[PDB]
Each structure stands twice: as C-alpha cells, then as structure tokens.
Amino acid sequence: QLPGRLGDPSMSLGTDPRTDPRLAAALTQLGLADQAAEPPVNANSEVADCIAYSTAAEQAWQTLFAMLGSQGEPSNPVDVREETIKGRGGNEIKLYIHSPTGHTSDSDPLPCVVHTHGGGMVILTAADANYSRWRSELAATGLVVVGVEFRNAAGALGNHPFPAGLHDCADAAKWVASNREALGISTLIMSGESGGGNLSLATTMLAKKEGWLEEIAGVYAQCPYISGLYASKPEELPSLLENDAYFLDMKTMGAMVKPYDPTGENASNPLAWPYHASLEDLAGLPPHVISVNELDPLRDEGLAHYRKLLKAGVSTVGRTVHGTCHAADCSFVDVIPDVYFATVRDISAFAYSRA
Amino acid sequence: QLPGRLGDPSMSLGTDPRTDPRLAAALTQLGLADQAAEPPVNANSEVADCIAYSTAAEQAWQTLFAMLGSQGEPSNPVDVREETIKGRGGNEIKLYIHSPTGHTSDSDPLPCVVHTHGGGMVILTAADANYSRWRSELAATGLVVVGVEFRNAAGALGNHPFPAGLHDCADAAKWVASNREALGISTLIMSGESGGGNLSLATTMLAKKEGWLEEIAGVYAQCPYISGLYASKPEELPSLLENDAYFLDMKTMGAMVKPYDPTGENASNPLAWPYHASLEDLAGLPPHVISVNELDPLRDEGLAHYRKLLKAGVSTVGRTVHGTCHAADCSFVDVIPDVYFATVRDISAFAYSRA
C-alpha cells in the first residue's frame, strides 16, 4: 500500500501508521487528527473573501498554538527586550530580541538567529506565545534571537500583500547586520518555518539581488511553504495529495495564496514563492538547511527546493523530521519534547557552525 | 514517476534526481555511481563461500574508505590513546579512546559516545581511517569517544559469529560505565552506523536483558542494518527494491548475513537482527535517535524500527539525511562536508542533551 492518502483516501493524521503516537493523541484532543474540513473559500474566491476568512480564523489559531507554547519555559534564563526600527518605506517594525540573561555588548559575541514566523505570510504574529517560546528556547542555547514583527497579508497585522512582509524581514536582517556590536553577536542566520521558511529563503535571495548577501551567514528553513501551487495539484508534488487535509488542506491554502498575491502576477516570482527559483537566483548563496515534516503536504516542495539549491552549488543539508505533521516540531514541546528539542539543538548548532 | 528503481528499474545513484550532485560526481569518478554488480555468492551459497567472499571484500571497502577518510583532521585538537580490556569470555578487546587535547580525569566531565563501527558485523575495523576520523571529529566537539574493536564474523578480525561482536560491544560499554571518573565522563550513549547501528541497538537491548540498562543514557543509531532480510524482498520494505544496487547490493548482503549467523537459527532473534524485536522487547529503552539515508535500500527497516520504538513508548526521534547513499554522511567528508558535519553536530548535541 502506498503511503497516506495515496494508498487510502480516507486516511488522516489520526489513522496514518506513520504518525508519532504521542502527536496523534494530542491532535485528537485538539480536533486536528481527522481530515481538515473543506473551507467555505478557495482559490476562485474573491480576494476580499479570502482576506476576511483568514482574518476571521486568526484568533482561533493563535489560541490553539499558544496553549502548546505557554505552559512552560526554557531550562536556561532568557531576557526579552523590544526594539522598533524603520522599514525602507518608513513603516515601524517591532523586533523582539531574546538573549541569555546577562548577555550584553561587553559579552563574548553569540551567534544570531533572525527569526521569521509562520502563518503563510498571511496571519499570526511574532508576539504569539508559540513563537516567543521558540525564540526563547533558541536563545537559551546561547543565541541572540531576533523575532521580526513583519506586515501580514491579512489579520491583525494586515492587509499588506507581497512584498511588504519580505521587505520588513529584509530590513530587519539589515538592521541586525549593522548592529552586531550593540547586539553582542557574531554571525547571523535566517530561520523560520512554513510561511516563515518562505520569508527566510526569500530574504536571502533578496539580499543577493540588493548587494548585501555577505551579511547573511546561513539559512535554516523549516517546512517551507514555497510553491503557491495548492490549487493546481501539480504532478511533481505528490505529497500535496498524499498528506492533503493533514492539518493543512489544499483548498484552504489556495485561498490563502490570494491575500499574499492578489493579482496572481507573482505566481512564478521566486521572491514570493521560492520553489520557482532558477539556479541563477540561488548561485552564491550561503549554506542552507532545509528541514521538512514527514506527514506534511508541503514536504515535496521543500525537498524539491533542497535539490534546486544543491544544483545551484549551494551547500545544502536536507532533513526529514519523521512522525510529524506540518511544523509539529516547532510547537508541540509538551507532547514530543524530544523531537522539538532535536530541532532546537540542530538550528543552534548550525548557527554556531557559521561563526 | 515513483522514486528510484520503483519508477525506473535502470536508475542508479548517478542518474537519480535525488542524489546530492556532489556525491553523484564523486561516486562517478570512483566508478560507484552505476548500479552495483551482481555478487559471486548469494544467500544460497555455502557459508564457507560467503565467509571467503566477505573476507575477500574487506580490503576493497577499506581502500575506498581510507581515501575518503584520512585527508584532513578535526578543527580542534584531539588526543587518542589505546586501552585493552577483557571480554566476558576472556578475549582481549582493544579500545580507541579519543578526547579533546588536555582532557583528563581532573577536567569537568564530558559526555561520552561508545562507538560501534559498521561493516555488517562481518568486516572492517575500528582502526580503519574513516572510523578513526569519525571518532576524532566527534571528540573535537567536546566528547570522549570510545571506539570498540569488536570481533567480526569474517575478515581480519574473524571468524566469530553472533553473539561475539555483540558481547564485545556490551562489555566495552560496561567497562566505560565502570570507569566514568577515570575517563572524565558524565553520561554515555551508544552510537554507530549500518552494522554498527545494529550493534548499538542490540547492545542496549542486551543491557536491558542483563539489568545494566541504566548505564546507557541514549542511542544514536545511523542507517541501521537490522532486518537480515536482504535475500527475500519483504513487501513491507519497499526501499530494498527502490534503492537496490545503490552502493549496497541486496543479493550481496544476503550472502553477508550468513557469516554472522551460519546456522540461520538467529534470523528472528532481536539481539542479532533488532528489526524483529517485539513491543515488549523495546519497552523501557532510553531515548533513541534513528537516522537513515534517503537513497539507501536499508532506509525502510530503519524507519520501521523507529516507529516500533515509538509504539513501545520509547522516546524516539527519526531523521532522514537527504541526498545520500547508505552511510555517506559518515565518510564522504571531503565531498559533502556540510552533511557529514551536520550529522557529527547532531550526535554530539544529542550526547550533551543526555548529561
């Protein structure tokens, strides 16, 4: 039998023999083990209706993710402070700066992660408890972690289509790069998951285009949401069928593409959807790690991009995190702590390896 | 198209779109990118002929690994010393002990890895350049690494069938566990690849059987060679077909099973072939990481074991290393250094996480 829904169309995260049983049990309690429901909007819906749907959904997702993340704290003490910087267009960008307690500009410099959160570039915020927890767990390993509060296509921080969020992430990375002494940092890597994996990849491609690529020492992109092809069911990406409605569903994602690119004119623009990068777009980029989730419909576009990076001559490591739905290793610290912390340690070790 | 030879029976490491192109290029120059040849012996061959073949094959593998493994040294200085201990039956077991230069019994204790090398439990030695390099690279991250020179079923260190090598690995681990102060170590994990993945898993199961399980804080098993089913195409293990003759040839491994278990009486003994463990056999084991290679015919038995460990309630992380043939991340340091060191960092971080 072929895996997932290729072998059994009725299969779900709750019934798939590949799911980590601890995660399956937690998903069942959250109502997320069964196949995701069909949404009232899709890729053919009007932009305004796609925006409204995403905006209406945001709080419920925030509530769910927060409870995964608010019930504890890192083993080592961490400080968080806020800084506001100016975007290229004059907008104010909030940064959440996480560091080990006692770390100052007089300390031995630590590696830095510029963190770009998920939510499909459309919803969720850096202030959300799951993302704050993630940045603090990273900082606790001996890192300065900068959480970018970038503009979103919808929701509380909307409504700002591509390239607004990308520009904010780029401007934040540039600020970090020009404030190394003040932050007490050595090198800088971009990292994030899902829509944030997209933004970390795209920020680095943009740095190349803008002549500041040397500031970025590496990229650790988790479960990247990078094809934009969820409405088109491309044959080259079987995971879209195999794991459809495993937390994420094609129809919902197809609707969520629209707020990011309302005209559709960026469907093959690598800065909007990195999966579409040419070798030339990637040439000369610093080392990358691409980390995908086994039971994720986005798995194959992440792995395809991993292969593209290699073809372009980029130093690239590719990792599948087994037993996990989309982004589970970024959030489910109370249920699969071994998996969660394996990823935290991997990202931190990678950051250290670039210094 | 289905992946690898499932979609195209003529596919090889050299033509598979999944292969890391750096690895593909290196294999092509070595003449090892094409499908591996049909062996002169198989599972139907007399045991004596399988032993003779295995013994004859050892030199070719050693020569290949020597060139991959001796051309450099760790970034941090490492000392190596030798200690000889007594096995339970009275044989002498050589240990290669690698540590950061300056590390003594008076230093702050470091985590320890007891390393069990590959070679299908039949060939290769701890003194081989690739294994020495691996242990030194691990030590360079801040570890004491103990390389066990266990008895083999064939070759220079033969001919000792199951359970000889297993007993040697167990006895080495017990010695390390009884000499923590002298070695300057905190915790110890078992780690190794392929046949050494088997031995690390089996050593830990034997510790459970013998009541000294508490001494082992974790297990990091790479590309484990654990089913013993290479002659038969079990349908639950599609990778055996998908990636057959990618570096490893399954008909060949069917022959190499025989020196380990000449009577065949241990084919479903979990201490010889951990894939056959029951849920009760695995209950109570300490945390595991199972790390498989994407383009490895052994991939699926490793992943199956990962899932069984979880079903038995063991804390388990599962990782696929993409772009790689069997064990490539353990040896091809000059060709895919980012992948090689990603694994070194992962093992070390796991060891630290148990202390």
Coordinates of C-alpha atoms in Angstrom, one line a residue, chain B:
Chain B
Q1 CA 7.1 8.7 -11.7
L2 CA 7.6 6.6 -8.5
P3 CA 11.0 7.3 -6.9
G4 CA 14.3 5.4 -7.7
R5 CA 14.0 2.0 -9.2
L6 CA 10.3 1.7 -8.4
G7 CA 9.7 4.1 -11.2
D8 CA 12.7 3.3 -13.4
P9 CA 14.4 -0.1 -12.9
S10 CA 17.6 1.2 -14.7
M11 CA 18.0 4.1 -12.3
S12 CA 21.2 4.4 -10.3
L13 CA 22.8 6.8 -7.8
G14 CA 24.4 8.5 -10.8
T15 CA 21.0 9.1 -12.6
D16 CA 18.6 9.5 -9.6
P17 CA 17.3 13.1 -9.3
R18 CA 17.5 12.8 -5.5
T19 CA 21.3 12.2 -5.3
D20 CA 23.3 15.2 -3.9
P21 CA 25.2 16.2 -7.1
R22 CA 28.5 16.5 -5.2
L23 CA 28.1 12.9 -4.0
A24 CA 27.0 11.8 -7.5
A25 CA 30.1 13.4 -9.0
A26 CA 32.4 11.7 -6.5
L27 CA 30.8 8.3 -7.0
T28 CA 31.0 8.7 -10.7
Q29 CA 34.7 9.3 -10.6
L30 CA 35.1 6.3 -8.3
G31 CA 33.1 4.1 -10.7
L32 CA 30.5 3.6 -8.0
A33 CA 27.6 5.7 -9.3
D34 CA 26.3 3.0 -11.6
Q35 CA 24.2 0.0 -10.2
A36 CA 26.4 -2.2 -8.1
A37 CA 27.4 -5.5 -9.7
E38 CA 25.8 -8.9 -9.1
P39 CA 27.8 -10.8 -6.5
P40 CA 29.7 -14.1 -7.0
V41 CA 27.9 -15.5 -3.9
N42 CA 24.4 -15.2 -2.5
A43 CA 22.2 -16.4 0.3
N44 CA 22.1 -19.9 -1.3
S45 CA 25.9 -20.2 -1.3
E46 CA 27.6 -22.4 1.2
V47 CA 28.5 -20.5 4.4
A48 CA 32.2 -21.1 3.8
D49 CA 32.0 -19.4 0.4
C50 CA 30.1 -16.4 2.0
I51 CA 32.9 -16.1 4.6
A52 CA 35.6 -16.3 1.9
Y53 CA 33.8 -13.6 -0.1
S54 CA 33.3 -11.4 2.9
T55 CA 37.0 -11.8 3.8
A56 CA 37.9 -11.0 0.2
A57 CA 35.7 -7.9 0.1
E58 CA 37.1 -6.3 3.2
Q59 CA 40.2 -4.9 1.5
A60 CA 38.2 -3.2 -1.2
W61 CA 36.0 -1.5 1.3
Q62 CA 38.9 -0.4 3.4
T63 CA 40.7 1.0 0.5
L64 CA 37.6 3.0 -0.6
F65 CA 37.1 4.4 2.9
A66 CA 40.8 5.2 3.5
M67 CA 40.9 7.7 0.7
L68 CA 37.7 9.3 1.8
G69 CA 38.8 9.5 5.5
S70 CA 42.5 10.3 6.0
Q71 CA 42.8 13.6 4.1
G72 CA 42.3 16.0 6.9
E73 CA 41.9 16.4 10.7
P74 CA 39.4 18.0 13.1
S75 CA 39.4 21.8 13.6
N76 CA 40.0 21.2 17.3
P77 CA 43.0 19.2 18.6
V78 CA 42.3 15.6 19.8
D79 CA 44.3 13.0 21.6
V80 CA 43.9 9.3 21.0
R81 CA 45.0 6.6 23.4
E82 CA 44.6 2.8 23.5
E83 CA 43.3 0.7 26.3
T84 CA 42.8 -3.1 26.3
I85 CA 40.1 -4.7 28.3
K86 CA 38.9 -8.3 28.9
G87 CA 35.7 -9.6 27.5
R88 CA 33.4 -11.8 29.5
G89 CA 34.8 -14.9 27.8
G90 CA 38.4 -13.9 28.3
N91 CA 39.3 -12.3 24.9
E92 CA 41.2 -9.0 24.8
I93 CA 39.2 -6.1 23.4
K94 CA 41.1 -3.0 22.2
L95 CA 39.6 0.4 22.8
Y96 CA 40.5 3.6 21.0
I97 CA 39.8 6.5 23.3
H98 CA 39.5 9.9 21.7
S99 CA 39.2 13.1 23.7
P100 CA 40.0 16.8 23.4
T101 CA 43.6 17.5 23.9
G102 CA 44.2 18.4 27.6
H103 CA 41.2 16.4 28.8
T104 CA 42.0 14.4 32.0
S105 CA 40.2 12.8 34.9
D106 CA 40.6 16.2 36.6
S107 CA 38.7 18.1 33.9
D108 CA 35.0 18.9 34.0
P109 CA 33.4 15.7 32.8
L110 CA 32.4 15.4 29.1
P111 CA 29.6 13.4 27.5
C112 CA 30.7 10.1 26.1
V113 CA 30.0 8.2 22.9
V114 CA 30.7 4.5 22.8
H115 CA 31.1 4.0 19.0
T116 CA 30.3 0.7 17.3
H117 CA 31.5 0.8 13.7
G118 CA 29.8 -0.6 10.5
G119 CA 30.7 -3.3 8.1
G120 CA 27.6 -5.6 8.6
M121 CA 29.1 -7.1 11.7
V122 CA 31.3 -9.1 9.4
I123 CA 34.2 -6.8 8.1
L124 CA 36.1 -3.5 8.8
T125 CA 37.9 -2.4 11.9
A126 CA 37.9 0.4 14.5
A127 CA 41.4 1.2 13.4
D128 CA 40.3 2.0 9.9
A129 CA 40.9 5.6 8.8
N130 CA 37.3 6.5 8.3
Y131 CA 36.3 5.3 11.8
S132 CA 39.3 6.9 13.5
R133 CA 38.4 10.2 11.7
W134 CA 34.8 9.9 12.8
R135 CA 35.6 9.4 16.4
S136 CA 38.1 12.2 16.4
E137 CA 35.6 14.6 14.7
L138 CA 33.1 13.7 17.4
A139 CA 35.7 14.1 20.2
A140 CA 36.7 17.5 18.7
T141 CA 33.2 18.8 19.6
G142 CA 33.9 18.1 23.3
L143 CA 33.3 14.4 23.7
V144 CA 35.2 11.3 24.9
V145 CA 34.6 8.8 22.2
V146 CA 35.4 5.1 22.8
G147 CA 35.9 3.0 19.6
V148 CA 35.3 -0.6 20.3
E149 CA 37.5 -3.1 18.4
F150 CA 35.0 -6.0 18.5
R151 CA 35.3 -9.5 17.0
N152 CA 33.9 -9.8 13.4
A153 CA 32.2 -12.7 11.6
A154 CA 34.8 -12.6 8.8
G155 CA 37.9 -10.8 7.6
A156 CA 41.0 -9.8 9.5
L157 CA 39.2 -9.9 12.8
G158 CA 37.2 -13.1 12.1
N159 CA 35.7 -15.5 12.2
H160 CA 33.3 -15.0 15.1
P161 CA 29.6 -15.4 14.5
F162 CA 26.8 -13.8 16.6
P163 CA 26.9 -13.1 19.5
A164 CA 30.7 -12.5 19.7
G165 CA 30.8 -8.9 18.4
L166 CA 27.7 -8.0 20.4
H167 CA 29.3 -9.3 23.6
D168 CA 32.4 -7.3 22.9
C169 CA 30.3 -4.1 22.4
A170 CA 28.4 -4.8 25.6
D171 CA 31.5 -5.5 27.6
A172 CA 33.1 -2.3 26.3
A173 CA 30.1 -0.3 27.3
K174 CA 30.1 -1.9 30.8
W175 CA 33.8 -1.0 31.1
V176 CA 33.2 2.6 30.1
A177 CA 30.2 2.7 32.6
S178 CA 32.5 1.5 35.4
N179 CA 35.3 3.9 34.6
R180 CA 33.5 7.3 34.4
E181 CA 35.8 9.0 36.8
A182 CA 38.9 7.7 35.1
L183 CA 37.7 8.7 31.6
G184 CA 36.4 12.1 32.8
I185 CA 32.9 11.5 31.5
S186 CA 29.3 12.2 32.5
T187 CA 26.8 10.1 30.6
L188 CA 27.3 7.7 27.8
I189 CA 25.4 7.0 24.6
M190 CA 25.8 4.1 22.1
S191 CA 26.2 5.2 18.5
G192 CA 27.2 3.6 15.2
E193 CA 26.2 3.1 11.6
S194 CA 24.9 0.2 9.5
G195 CA 26.2 -3.0 11.1
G196 CA 27.3 -0.6 13.9
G197 CA 23.7 0.8 14.1
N198 CA 22.6 -2.8 14.7
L199 CA 25.3 -3.4 17.4
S200 CA 24.4 -0.1 19.2
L201 CA 20.7 -1.0 19.2
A202 CA 21.4 -4.7 20.2
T203 CA 23.9 -3.7 22.9
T204 CA 21.3 -1.6 24.6
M205 CA 18.7 -4.4 24.3
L206 CA 21.3 -6.7 25.9
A207 CA 21.8 -4.2 28.7
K208 CA 18.1 -4.4 29.4
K209 CA 18.2 -8.2 29.4
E210 CA 21.3 -8.2 31.7
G211 CA 19.9 -5.5 34.1
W212 CA 22.5 -2.7 33.5
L213 CA 20.3 -0.6 31.2
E214 CA 20.6 2.4 33.5
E215 CA 24.2 2.8 32.4
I216 CA 23.2 3.8 28.8
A217 CA 21.7 7.3 28.6
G218 CA 20.7 7.1 24.9
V219 CA 21.3 5.6 21.5
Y220 CA 22.0 7.3 18.2
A221 CA 21.7 4.6 15.5
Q222 CA 22.6 5.5 11.9
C223 CA 21.3 3.7 8.8
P224 CA 20.8 0.5 10.8
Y225 CA 21.4 -2.8 9.2
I226 CA 18.8 -4.7 11.2
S227 CA 16.3 -6.9 9.3
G228 CA 18.6 -9.6 7.8
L229 CA 16.0 -10.0 5.0
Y230 CA 18.2 -8.9 2.0
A231 CA 17.7 -12.1 0.1
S232 CA 13.9 -12.0 0.2
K233 CA 12.1 -8.7 -0.8
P234 CA 9.7 -8.4 2.1
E235 CA 6.9 -6.1 0.7
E236 CA 6.8 -4.0 3.9
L237 CA 10.3 -2.7 3.0
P238 CA 10.0 -1.1 -0.5
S239 CA 13.4 0.7 -0.1
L240 CA 15.0 -2.7 -0.7
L241 CA 13.8 -2.5 -4.3
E242 CA 13.7 1.2 -4.7
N243 CA 17.3 1.7 -3.9
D244 CA 18.8 -1.7 -4.6
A245 CA 22.3 -1.6 -6.0
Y246 CA 22.7 2.0 -4.8
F247 CA 26.2 1.5 -3.3
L248 CA 24.9 -1.6 -1.4
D249 CA 23.6 -4.6 -3.3
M250 CA 20.9 -6.7 -1.6
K251 CA 21.8 -10.0 -3.1
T252 CA 25.3 -9.4 -1.8
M253 CA 24.1 -8.6 1.7
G254 CA 22.0 -11.8 1.6
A255 CA 25.4 -13.6 1.4
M256 CA 27.0 -11.4 4.0
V257 CA 24.2 -12.3 6.5
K258 CA 25.5 -15.9 6.6
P259 CA 28.9 -15.4 8.3
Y260 CA 27.0 -13.6 11.2
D261 CA 24.6 -16.5 11.6
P262 CA 25.9 -19.6 9.9
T263 CA 23.2 -21.9 11.2
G264 CA 20.4 -19.4 10.3
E265 CA 19.0 -20.1 13.8
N266 CA 19.0 -16.4 14.8
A267 CA 17.1 -14.9 11.8
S268 CA 14.3 -13.7 14.1
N269 CA 16.5 -13.2 17.2
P270 CA 16.2 -9.5 18.0
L271 CA 19.7 -9.4 19.5
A272 CA 21.1 -10.5 16.1
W273 CA 18.5 -8.5 14.0
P274 CA 16.8 -5.8 16.0
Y275 CA 14.1 -5.2 13.4
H276 CA 12.5 -8.4 14.7
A277 CA 12.1 -7.0 18.3
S278 CA 8.6 -7.3 19.9
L279 CA 7.0 -4.3 21.5
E280 CA 7.8 -5.9 24.9
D281 CA 11.5 -6.2 23.9
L282 CA 11.6 -2.5 23.3
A283 CA 9.7 -1.3 26.3
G284 CA 11.7 0.8 28.8
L285 CA 14.6 1.6 26.5
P286 CA 16.3 5.0 26.9
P287 CA 15.9 7.8 24.3
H288 CA 16.8 6.9 20.7
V289 CA 17.6 8.8 17.5
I290 CA 17.3 6.8 14.3
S291 CA 19.0 8.5 11.4
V292 CA 18.5 6.9 7.9
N293 CA 19.8 7.8 4.5
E294 CA 17.3 8.7 1.7
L295 CA 18.8 6.7 -1.1
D296 CA 19.6 3.6 0.9
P297 CA 17.9 0.2 0.4
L298 CA 18.1 -0.1 4.2
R299 CA 16.1 3.0 4.7
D300 CA 12.7 1.4 5.4
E301 CA 13.9 -1.1 8.0
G302 CA 15.4 1.8 10.0
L303 CA 12.2 3.8 9.7
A304 CA 10.1 0.7 10.7
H305 CA 12.3 0.3 13.8
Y306 CA 11.9 4.0 14.6
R307 CA 8.1 3.5 14.5
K308 CA 8.2 0.3 16.6
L309 CA 10.3 2.1 19.3
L310 CA 7.6 4.8 19.4
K311 CA 4.8 2.2 19.7
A312 CA 6.7 0.7 22.6
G313 CA 6.7 4.1 24.3
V314 CA 10.4 4.8 23.8
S315 CA 11.4 8.5 23.3
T316 CA 12.4 8.4 19.7
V317 CA 13.5 11.0 17.1
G318 CA 13.6 9.9 13.4
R319 CA 15.7 11.7 10.8
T320 CA 16.3 11.2 7.1
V321 CA 19.5 12.5 5.7
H322 CA 18.6 13.5 2.2
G323 CA 20.7 13.2 -1.0
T324 CA 22.8 10.4 0.5
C325 CA 23.5 6.8 -0.2
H326 CA 24.0 4.3 2.6
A327 CA 26.2 5.8 5.4
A328 CA 27.5 8.6 3.1
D329 CA 27.3 11.1 5.9
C330 CA 29.8 9.0 7.9
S331 CA 32.6 9.0 5.3
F332 CA 32.4 11.5 2.4
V333 CA 33.9 14.3 4.5
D334 CA 35.7 15.9 1.5
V335 CA 32.7 15.8 -0.8
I336 CA 29.7 16.6 1.3
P337 CA 31.3 18.2 4.4
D338 CA 28.1 20.1 5.3
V339 CA 26.2 16.9 5.5
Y340 CA 29.0 15.0 7.3
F341 CA 29.3 17.7 10.0
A342 CA 25.6 18.2 10.3
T343 CA 25.5 14.6 11.5
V344 CA 28.5 15.0 13.7
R345 CA 26.9 18.0 15.4
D346 CA 23.6 16.2 15.7
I347 CA 25.2 13.2 17.5
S348 CA 27.2 15.4 19.8
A349 CA 24.3 17.7 20.7
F350 CA 22.2 14.5 21.5
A351 CA 25.0 13.2 23.7
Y352 CA 25.2 16.6 25.5
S353 CA 21.4 16.6 25.9
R354 CA 21.5 13.4 28.0
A355 CA 24.0 14.7 30.5

